[PDB]
Design a protein around this ligand. Structure first.
Ligand code: FE
Length: 182
């Protein structure tokens, strides 16, 4: 388990780690990579209206690695992770992560577990056993850029209505893949 000097090195180290996964080790190497905008500028493609997903690597099928670009005030739904893992690392700016419990079957306001602000180079980890979350760039002045690793890869998740706990299936949309607009 070595310090990744560049994004390219990080990806190689991740391929080795996923050749079989140890969550703590993945989190450790992600934290250890020091964000360098020169490494990831190609993928940092923004949209005026919502956050974007920019695929970086497909993990020899073991994981999806993508960079998400968040305009001021852009946020996600409250969502799950489709029986998979999500690791997220801040590359620039700040994101607020709000944790929620899984809702009961009754319609009810959703129950907010905790919140934290993630800052540059910090990470977070979530899975369905931990709960649900919402990720948002609450800044009025600064975009955020984050690095997200999903394993196994998945295309869809559920968004939850905070007022009721009811969920709707949604399909991930890609803004770009391998630097190319899609
Ligand atoms: Fe998530």
């Amino acid at each position: 388990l070595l310090k990744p000097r560049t994004l390219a090195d990080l990806i190689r180290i991740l391929h080795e780690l996923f050749a079989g996964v140890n969550v703590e080790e993945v989190q450790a190497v992600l934290e250890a990579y020091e964000s360098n905008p020169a490494d990831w500028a190609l993928y940092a493609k923004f949209d005026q209206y919502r956050y974007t997903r920019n695929l970086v690597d497909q993990g020899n099928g073991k994981f999806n690695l993508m960079i998400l670009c968040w305009g001021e005030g852009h946020g996600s739904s409250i969502h799950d992770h489709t029986d998979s893992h999500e690791f997220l690392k801040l590359l620039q700016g700040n994101l607020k992560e709000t944790l929620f419990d899984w809702p009961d079957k009754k319609s009810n306001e959703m129950i907010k577990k905790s919140e934290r602000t993630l800052r540059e180079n910090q990470c977070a980890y979530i899975n369905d056993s931990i709960g649900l979350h919402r990720v948002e760039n609450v800044s009025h002045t600064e975009p955020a850029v984050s690095l997200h690793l999903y394993s196994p890869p998945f295309d869809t998740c559920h968004a939850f209505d905070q007022r009721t706990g009811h969920k709707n299936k949604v399909t991930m949309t890609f803004h770009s893949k391998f630097g190319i607009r899609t």
